[PDB]
Every structure is written in C-alpha cells, then in structure tokens.
Amino acid sequence: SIGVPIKVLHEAEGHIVTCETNTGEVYRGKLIEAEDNMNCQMSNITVTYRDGRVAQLEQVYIRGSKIRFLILPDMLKNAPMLK
Amino acid sequence: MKLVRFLMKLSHETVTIELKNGTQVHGTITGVDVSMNTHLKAVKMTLKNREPVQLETLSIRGNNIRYFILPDSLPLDTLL
Amino acid sequence: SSKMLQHIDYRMRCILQDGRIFIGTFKAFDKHMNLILCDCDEFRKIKPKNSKQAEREEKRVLGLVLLRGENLVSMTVEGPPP
Amino acid sequence: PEELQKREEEEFNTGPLSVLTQSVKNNTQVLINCRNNKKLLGRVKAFDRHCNMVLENVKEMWTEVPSKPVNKDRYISKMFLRGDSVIVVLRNPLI
Amino acid sequence: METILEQQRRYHEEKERLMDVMAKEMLTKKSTLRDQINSDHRTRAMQDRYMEVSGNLRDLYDDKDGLRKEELNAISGPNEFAEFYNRLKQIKEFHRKHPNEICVPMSVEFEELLKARENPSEEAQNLVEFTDEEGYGRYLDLHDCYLKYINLKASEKLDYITYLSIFDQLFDIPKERKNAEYKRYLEMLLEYLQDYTDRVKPLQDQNELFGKIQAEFEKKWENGTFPGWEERAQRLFSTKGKSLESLDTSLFAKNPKSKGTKRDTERNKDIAFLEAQIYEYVEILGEQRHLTHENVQRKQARTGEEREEEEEEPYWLYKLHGLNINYNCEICGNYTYRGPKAFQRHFAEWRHAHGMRCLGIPNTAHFANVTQIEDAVSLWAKL
Amino acid sequence: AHPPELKKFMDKKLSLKLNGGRHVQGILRGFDPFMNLVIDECVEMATSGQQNNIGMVVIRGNSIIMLEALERV
Amino acid sequence: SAFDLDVVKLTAQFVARNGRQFLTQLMQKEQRNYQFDFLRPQHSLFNYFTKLVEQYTKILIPPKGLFSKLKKEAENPREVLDQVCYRVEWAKFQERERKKEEEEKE
Amino acid sequence: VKLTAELIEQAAQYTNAVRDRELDLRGYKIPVIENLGATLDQFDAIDFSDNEIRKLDGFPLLRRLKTLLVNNNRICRIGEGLDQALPCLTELILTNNSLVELGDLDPLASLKSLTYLSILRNPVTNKKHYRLYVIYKVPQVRVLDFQKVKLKERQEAEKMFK
RNA sequence: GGAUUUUUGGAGCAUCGACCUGGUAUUGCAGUACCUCCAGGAACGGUGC
Numbered sequence A: 001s002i003g004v005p006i007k008v009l010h011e012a013e014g015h016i017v018t019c020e021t022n023t024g025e026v027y028r029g030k031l032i033e034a035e036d037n038m039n040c041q042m043s044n045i046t047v048t049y050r051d052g053r054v055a056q057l058e059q060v061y062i063r064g065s066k067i068r069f070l071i072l073p074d075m076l077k078n079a080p081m082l083k
Numbered sequence B: 001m002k003l004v005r006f007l008m009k010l011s012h013e014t015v016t017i018e019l020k021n022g023t024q025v026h027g028t029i030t031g032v033d034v035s036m037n038t039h040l041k042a043v044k045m046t047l048k049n050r051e052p053v054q055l056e057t058l059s060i061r062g063n064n065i066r067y068f069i070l071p072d073s074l075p076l077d078t079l080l
Numbered sequence C: 001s002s003k004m005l006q007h008i009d010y011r012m013r014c015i016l017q018d019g020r021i022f023i024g025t026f027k028a029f030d031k032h033m034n035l036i037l038c039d040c041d042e043f044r045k046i047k048p049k050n051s052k053q054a055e056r057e058e059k060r061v062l063g064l065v066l067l068r069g070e071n072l073v074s075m076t077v078e079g080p081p082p
Numbered sequence D: 001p002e003e004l005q006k007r008e009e010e011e012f013n014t015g016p017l018s019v020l021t022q023s024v025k026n027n028t029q030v031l032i033n034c035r036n037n038k039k040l041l042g043r044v045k046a047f048d049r050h051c052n053m054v055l056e057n058v059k060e061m062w063t064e065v066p067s068k069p070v071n072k073d074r075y076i077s078k079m080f081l082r083g084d085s086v087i088v089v090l091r092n093p094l095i
Numbered sequence E: 001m002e003t004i005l006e007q008q009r010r011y012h013e014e015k016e017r018l019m020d021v022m023a024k025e026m027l028t029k030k031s032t033l034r035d036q037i038n039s040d041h042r043t044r045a046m047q048d049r050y051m052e053v054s055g056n057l058r059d060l061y062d063d064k065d066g067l068r069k070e071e072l073n074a075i076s077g078p079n080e081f082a083e084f085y086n087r088l089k090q091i092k093e094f095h096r097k098h099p100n101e102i103c104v105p106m107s108v109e110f111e112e113l114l115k116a117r118e119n120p121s122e123e124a125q126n127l128v129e130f131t132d133e134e135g136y137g138r139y140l141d142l143h144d145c146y147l148k149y150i151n152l153k154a155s156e157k158l159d160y161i162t163y164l165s166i167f168d169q170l171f172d173i174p175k176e177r178k179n180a181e182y183k184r185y186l187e188m189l190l191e192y193l194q195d196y197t198d199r200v201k202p203l204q205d206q207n208e209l210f211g212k213i214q215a216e217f218e219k220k221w222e223n224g225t226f227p228g229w230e231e232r233a234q235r236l237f238s239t240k241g242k243s244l245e246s247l248d249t250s251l252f253a254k255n256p257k258s259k260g261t262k263r264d265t266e267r268n269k270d271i272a273f274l275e276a277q278i279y280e281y282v283e284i285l286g287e288q289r290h291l292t293h294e295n296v297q298r299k300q301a302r303t304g305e306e307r308e309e310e311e312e313e314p315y316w317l318y319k320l321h322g323l324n325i326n327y328n329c330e331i332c333g334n335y336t337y338r339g340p341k342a343f344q345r346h347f348a349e350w351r352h353a354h355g356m357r358c359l360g361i362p363n364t365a366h367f368a369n370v371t372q373i374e375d376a377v378s379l380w381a382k383l
Numbered sequence F: 001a002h003p004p005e006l007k008k009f010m011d012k013k014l015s016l017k018l019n020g021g022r023h024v025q026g027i028l029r030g031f032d033p034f035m036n037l038v039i040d041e042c043v044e045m046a047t048s049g050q051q052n053n054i055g056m057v058v059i060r061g062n063s064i065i066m067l068e069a070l071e072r073v
Numbered sequence G: 001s002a003f004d005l006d007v008v009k010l011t012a013q014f015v016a017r018n019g020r021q022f023l024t025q026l027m028q029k030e031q032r033n034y035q036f037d038f039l040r041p042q043h044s045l046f047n048y049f050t051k052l053v054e055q056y057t058k059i060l061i062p063p064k065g066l067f068s069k070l071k072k073e074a075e076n077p078r079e080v081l082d083q084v085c086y087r088v089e090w091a092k093f094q095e096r097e098r099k100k101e102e103e104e105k106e
Numbered sequence H: 001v002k003l004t005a006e007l008i009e010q011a012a013q014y015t016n017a018v019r020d021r022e023l024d025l026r027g028y029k030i031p032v033i034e035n036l037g038a039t040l041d042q043f044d045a046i047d048f049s050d051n052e053i054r055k056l057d058g059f060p061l062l063r064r065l066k067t068l069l070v071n072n073n074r075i076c077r078i079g080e081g082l083d084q085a086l087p088c089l090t091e092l093i094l095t096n097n098s099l100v101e102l103g104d105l106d107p108l109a110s111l112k113s114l115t116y117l118s119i120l121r122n123p124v125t126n127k128k129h130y131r132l133y134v135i136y137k138v139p140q141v142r143v144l145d146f147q148k149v150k151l152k153e154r155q156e157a158e159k160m161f162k
Numbered sequence I: 001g002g003a004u005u006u007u008u009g010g011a012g013c014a015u016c017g018a019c020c021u022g023g024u025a026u027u028g029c030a031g032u033a034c035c036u037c038c039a040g041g042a043a044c045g046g047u048g049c
Helices: A004-011 A074-078 B004-008 D002-014 D018-023 E006-027 E033-058 E064-071 E078-087 E103-108 E143-153 E160-167 E182-200 E206-219 E245-252 E269-284 E286-301 E304-311 E315-320 E340-347 E350-356 E373-382 G002-015 G045-058 G062-066 G077-105 H005-009 H130-137 H151-159
Strands: A016-020 A026-034 A040-047 A055-057 A060-062 A069-072 B013-019 B024-032 B038-046 B053-060 B065-070 C010-016 C021-029 C035-046 C056-067 C072-079 D029-033 D038-046 D053-062 D073-081 E327-329 E335-337 F013-017 F023-030 F037-045 F051-053 F056-059 F066-069 H012-015 H021-024 H045-047 H067-069 H091-093 H116-118
Touching: A004 A069, A004 C021, A004 C035, A004 C056, A016 A040, A026 A060, A040 F066, A074 C056, B013 B038, B024 B053, C010 C035, C021 C056, D002 D018, D018 D029, D018 D038, D038 D073, D073 E143, E006 E033, E006 E103, E006 G045, E006 G062, E006 G077, E033 G077, E064 G062, E078 G002, E143 E160, E143 E182, E160 E286, E182 E269, E206 E269, E269 E286, E286 E304, E327 E340, E335 E340, E340 E350, F013 F037, F023 F056, G002 G045, H130 H151
Parallel strands: H021 H045, H045 H067, H067 H091, H091 H116
Antiparallel strands: A016 A026, A016 A069, A026 A040, A040 A055, A040 A060, A060 F066, A069 C056, B013 B024, B013 B065, B024 B038, B038 B053, B053 C072, B065 D073, C010 C021, C010 C072, C021 C035, C035 C056, D029 D038, D038 D053, D053 D073, E327 E335, F013 F023, F013 F066, F023 F037, F037 F051, F037 F056, H012 H021
C-alpha cells in the first residue's frame, strides 16, 4: 500500500516545501510532482551546497536515497490523513 | 531459520543495544518486531564521548542497531 | 504489534544519523520508519574546536517535517500531546 | 516448506556460510570483524541467511588511541551481532 | 513554645507509635521473600526515623535546666496561665474539627490492603536496590565479576565453576600476584559484596559491624592474625615471613615496610582493608554464595526448556417504550421522571403518597393525575 | 519497482551531482527503474577549472543525489 | 476542636508542675471566674485530660530527657528490635488470655 | 490562587510567532512563580502576562529558555539567582513594573548572554541617566527598550560614575 | 523480508550568518529562502577539505 508520510508528501505537491540532501544541502522550492519512493521534483529550487551559498536552480529533482528530511509548509497541518 | 524470530520472543529483558554511530542504549526491551525495531522503557543511552542520559521510553530501528548484548541468564536453545 | 502507534501524536524527539535531534509531534508513521513531525525543531551540536570553548547546540524550527527512515536512528518521548 | 528448508540446509552446509556451519558442528570459535574495527572472537550458537550471529562467551578487542593506542578488550557472556556490520569472518583464528 | 513540655511529649508519642508499628510488623507473618525484605527495609527506615527523632529530642535540654527553676516554682502559676488563655481567646469562627492530632501518625505508620507499604515508604521499591538475578537476597550476581576476572587474566581457561572455586578461598594462596592489577578488581568485588551484605540485612546495624570489622583489622590483622608452628608469622602487606615476634615487631617499623616498597602499609593499606572486608563478607555470607553456586550448577545442568521455565519465574428499548423523556413532577419536590408509564406507576406509590401527605390531601383516585400543588389543593378543597 | 518521472528531463541538457563532491553535465538519453541515467556529451567538472569530456556516461542511482535541468524542460 | 485540645494541653501542662494533689494551678483558677468544664470527671474529655496529664508527668521523668540521655533507645537498633519482639510476645499473650477468657465464657 | 504544576500542565503550549515553543499563561494572577520545572526544558519562551508576582524569583534551572515575558505585572524587586537558572536567556521583557531605584537592575547584569531588554513603562526610566546606567551595568545588552545601543551612549556610560 | 530510492552499512582555503559607525530614496496593506546602495573597523561563529 501507501504510507501516511508518503501520502502527506504526495499531498504537499504544489506548495513550497524544502528537501534536505545527504551532503547537507537544503533545497527549498515548489514541489511539482512527487513519487512513492520520496522522489522530490521541485521548481525554483534554492541550493545551499552545505555552505549557505543559495543558488537559484530550475527544475531540480532529488532522489529518495539522499533525501534526509522534507520540511512541509504549515498549510498541510490540518490534513485528514494525519488526524 | 531467521534470527529475527529469536529476537522477537524477548520481553522484560534488560539488554544493551549498541548502535552504529557510537551510541549504546541499555534498558528493558519491551517490544520487538520483524523489522528488528526495539522499543524499550526506562533506558540509559550513552553516545560517542558524551554523558549517559536517561529516557523513559526509546524506539531504536533495525538498520541503526549494530550489536546486542543479552544477560547471562538467557538460554539460547529454547529461543531458537 | 502496535508499539509504534502507541506514541503517535506526542512530542517525541528522534535522533538523526548525523547527530542532530528533531523534536516534534510525530502524527504519522509508516513501515519504512518514516515520521511526520508537526512543528518540528532540529537541534545540531557544534564542535568547540578549542581548549576553553564550550559545546553548543544550534536549534532551528521548520514546522511540518517528513523524515525518512534512512536517517532516523532512535526516537524517544519528551512531552505529552498538548 | 520442507523443500525450502532442505535447500536452506544445503546452502548452509555447502555454501559460503559452511565455515559458520563449522561453528555449530564442533563448537569452534570464529573471529568476526565489525565496522567499528572491533574484532569479536567467540563461538556462534545460531546463524541465519542474513549473517545474523548469536555469540556465546565472546571477547571483543579493538584499538583506542588515548602516543600509542592500547588494546582495550572486553568479554561478553551472550551477544547478538547483525550481518550488516560483519565484514570478514575467520573460521580458524591464530590465537 | 513548649519545647520541654509539648515537643518532648510529641517526640515520645512518635517513638511509641514507631515502636507499635515495629511490633505490629514483627508480629505479622511473612509469606514471600520480597515482601519480607520490603518489610525489613520499612522497619529499618522507621528505626532510622525514630533514632533521628530521639537525637533531635535529646538535644532540647539546654534551656530546660534554666526553665526548670521557673516551671517548678509554686509562687508563680495562674498569672501566666491566664495570660496564655487571654492569648488563646481569639475568634472561634473556624468551624472545623481536626481529629488528626494522633490519628495521622497512626495512619502514616500503617499500610493499605492493595499495597503493603507505609506512607513515608510509599516511594520505596525493591527493584531499585537489587537485580533480577539476585532474587532480593536469594542469590548473588557473579557474571560481571567473572567477566572482569577473565578480562584481567587475559585467558579463556576459566569458567564460572573455576571462578567460584577461586573465590571460595579465604586464607589459601591467591590465583594471581598480590602486587598485580587483580587488586583493582578485588576492591570492586569487595565493594559489591559489602553492598550485597548491607542489602541482605537492612535491620542489622551496619555501622557497628563496620566498626567491629575495623577493630578486628587494626588490633588483630595488623599484629599477626595467622600464627604458625617464615611460617611462624606472615604479613599481609609485605608478603614475607618472620622468625619470631620480636623480629616482626622490629620489622613492622622498618623503612621498606613503612613506605619504601610498592606494597607497604602506606599505599597498599586500602587494598589490604578491602581484602579483609571481602574475606569477612565471604565468611559471613558463605551460605548465600553456596546457594548461588548451587543455582548456577542447576542452571548449567538443565536443558534449554528448563532454563527458560526457571528464567520466566439499548436505544431501541428506550425509544419504543417511551423512555429517556424528561417529565417534571411538582408534587414530590419537582422530581424528574424518565417515562409516562413510569410516572403513572410512581403516582400510586409510597413516595407520591408521602409527598401528598405533607399538604394534607388524602390518597385517593381523584388526585392520580394531579401534578401541581395548587391544582391538588383546589381539588381537595372542592371535594 | 516504479520508474521515476524522468520524461520531462529526456533529451534535455541537465547537470547532476554525484556523491563525494562529483558533478557532471550532459543530455539525458534514457531512464531506468533503478534511477540509472545515461548522459551524452558528458562533461565532468572537477574542483579545478578544467572540465573533462566523457562522450557517453552511465551513472547509477546510488550515487546520484540531485539533478538540475539547465533547459526549460 | 483545636481550641479545646489546646486548652486541655495547657491545663495538663499547668497541672503537672504542682507540688500537691489539690494545690495546683487549676484549682485556684476555678475560683478566679474562669470556666473550665474539663476539670470535672463527669465529662468525656476528662478521660483524655487525665491521659494528657499522665503523659506530661511521664515527660518530666529523669530518663525522659530532663537530666539524662537515653542511649539504648537512641543508639541501639537491636535493643529496639528486642523491645518490639517483647511487645509482640506480650500482645500474643494478651490475645491468648482473651481467647482463654472467651472459651471460659462459652 | 497559587501557581503549581497543574496550571502549567493544563496551559496551552504551542509555536509562537518567533518560531519558538511558547506556553501561554495569561490571566492567572499568580503571586509567586514556583514549580516551573515540569516542562522538562521543552520550551523557549514563558509568558507571564496579567500576573500579581511581587518578585521575579524562584525559577528552576532551564537551559532551553531563551525569552522571558514578565509584562503587565507588579514586580517591585528582582532576584539575584537568575543567571544560574537561565544560562541561555536572550530576551527579557520587564515592561510595566514597579522598579523605582537603579539598584534593582544590578542582578540584571548577571546574564552574560542577554542581548534584548525591555524596561519601558517603569518609574526607574523616569529618573535621570537611567539608560546610561543600564548600558554601564550590562554591556552585553544590544537592544534596550526597542532601541539599539550607541557608541556615544557607551562613551557617556564609561565616562560617568568613574 | 538480504542486490542501486528507505530495513541486513560507504564504513591554511572557499562560502554563509552576524556586530558597530556616517550619507542616501521609499511613508508603502499582507501571508515570506534574502531584500536600497556605498565607505571604514572587527581581537564573532557554523559547514566541507
């Protein structure tokens, strides 16, 4: 089946989320489409490269193997899946 | 036979699970699943070169655990 | 069993693999050790790198955080559900 | 079933873990290396397909730098080791 | 304040209540070892509290020798008593009775049926001072000491039976050297054995036993406690013999024996005291060590199943019948009724008759459906 | 065993970042269910200013952490 | 009931320091227009006032802490345990005597 | 009504507007602050609005606390053991107090990590050279009464009371 | 329940966030990586090698 954090990450598409890479890079952008394997496709991403240097990249795609965390916006806090 | 079934049949045993990143939690293991998830109560956790803190409840994952330490009063013939 | 669902929606602190600790209200979980922490705050310890410097911990709040099971090490309860 | 159990017994008696089958035949001590450079020498009571071992009366030795590092060792009565941290398992140790 | 009159009487009453609680605890029979150990710990805590109360009451006698001249004087008297009665003439508007003057120490020194623990000893637990393998004083845990001895000896040729046989010796030859690193493990073993002896008997005087052990170590063990027939007199610190008592007395104050060695009486005195304490704990608790060795032999000789067995020890009926419907009856003090048929059955009952008898209306059939008091009074006056 | 949604990045010049500080850029020619990418005109950029041409490279999914599309996609 | 208990304790403290049976600090207070209903033996509080006066007289004993110090009850747990065992034996003897009296009555 | 652990456990603890954990305790009228150790260092801001606390003392050892809100109170005296209980205090809101003398802010310089201070709507600010004495007492404070410190003000503070 | 995305293991330099001084235009209604620019000092700190 599908997990409840997986469903929360799939329902968070279209809003401004922030994924975290395994090397310490945090990319914040609008999640266009998500997958069940934590594949985060985000537009207008802001890469940090673990040094604070935030560069503006377009159409970024981070895989689920390096995705350490996914900060979702507070608009999805009242979702019925989390109850 | 898999070794997860021997670890799942353990309740109210004061074990010591040493994690991968220099962490060691000694406590009474209250729950074990097929994915080696160890849920313990009233445990003491000591990290790498840190002070041993005490927690009322802890839930360590299977992939994060490196080794386990069982007491001497535990037969292995009946658990296998 | 259902030992992971007994501590749901409570103020729990999960220790990461890099040494950080994320404290938040873990409302949703899954079989892949994932966690949905509402109003989460991540605290990471910094090295002193000196002889007289102390060890500090920088804490930053992120809100709703979806933490995967590949980075989570151990989770402990810290506070009751408000 | 019974055929899968017979295939698992054949793979444990004639495969790569057959030296581990030497640990449960004559109760000989094996030396397993860990990911944290801690070598554990001891008898293996139970094993599995995922290299998860149950050690009885094991001795774990490692090198800890305080200079020159010392060989600080410990002795555990009963222990369990997962197969993810097992690097190299030697059937017949030197000492 | 009446420190010599009221406080001394209160301390004597508290000591009498503690003695009565101790007599009631000693008179009751015991059924389990853990409950007996908990009762012994509660009795030891009550004895310590009574000793602290007696020490607090025994120090309140400095001003009593100065106040006894004014208290025993017959020239004084009712003047200060009338002044104290005028001081105690305050407002008595606090209408509250306090029977807990003597009943509260009687209830604090007692236990409940659900939990046999006193009120100061409500937070005490036997699982915080003893392990599960010890059995609340039944056996002694020796697996960690055997593991430490195997780690110190650096050899795998010593099992639990060999460690129990090496630990059973009291005045024989040791297994290792006296100046080696085994003394650091022996001091920890003695510190564990002292805590095990103090936990196995909490009602015994540990300070008097420690003073007697120190007196036996100073007066007897330091002056040749093991005579012979080099074999005549042996020293525990220097580990050397003596020809006679005069040679040992001359060599006791020698320069290598005082501080000119690595095992003299200056640095190795604490190790010798720990060895003497371990010998006294082995001699006093030899039966517990024999029971632990027998339990270890029974656990080793058993199979896996025997060791595992030893280690484990309705809305439809309320809606169809007209129930759950609020009805008010103003005759019987505006009571509530949850049904029309229930109110019709309670109208010809004893409660409605007792409610109607206060107004003076007789119990008849005309006032069956009467609810208001004014309508019932008008129906009684019309007839 | 579901394949990733790499249809928009197909036949487009992007730049991926491998593990250990490695980074390459090229045109994605295909996709795999194990997140393995095929890059044509691959130019690997080291810590120095020089870039090494590879021609045709095959990157696995266990090393690829991120990939930014340099085109409109 | 705190004021009446305090008045009874004050009367027991003032009556225990008397040098005679009738020449006390409470017999002259009855003639000094002070209402004290606890002095008469017809009341139920007189049985508690007599016990309070007995405790005040026993608190003035020479081994009660006025000119001496108790050592067996304050510095010997074995003596307290022997006293508790003697009290338990006396209670068992009293229970056996009560059972014998009940058997004789039956 | 005295403050206890039941009033702190039943209070609403949530996320504030400064992205920190804050527990609301407004409308309590607690005369003394005590038994505040039941939070287990899981809060960063403690609000004490509309309280009758005469003295700000009796605070347990809390290392996670970084903001103190004691506005709308009747605090006349200040405690001395405040630096040993809150080592990571950064914000102090002591507005609308009963401070009259300048000696009440002398333990307030004991906090080394303090940077934000608010002593507005107080009789201590009506006296002359109050801001200069507050700058000379605690030099680590960067924001005093919603105003940054000045170099000329620091020079006047170092020149005065020599 | 063992084969790449979760669970039987890859184990002195650059950058960013601050701190303090002066000139400068915007006086404006909104749910946020970050928002005016220049000049001077710093004996502040995190991350990677």
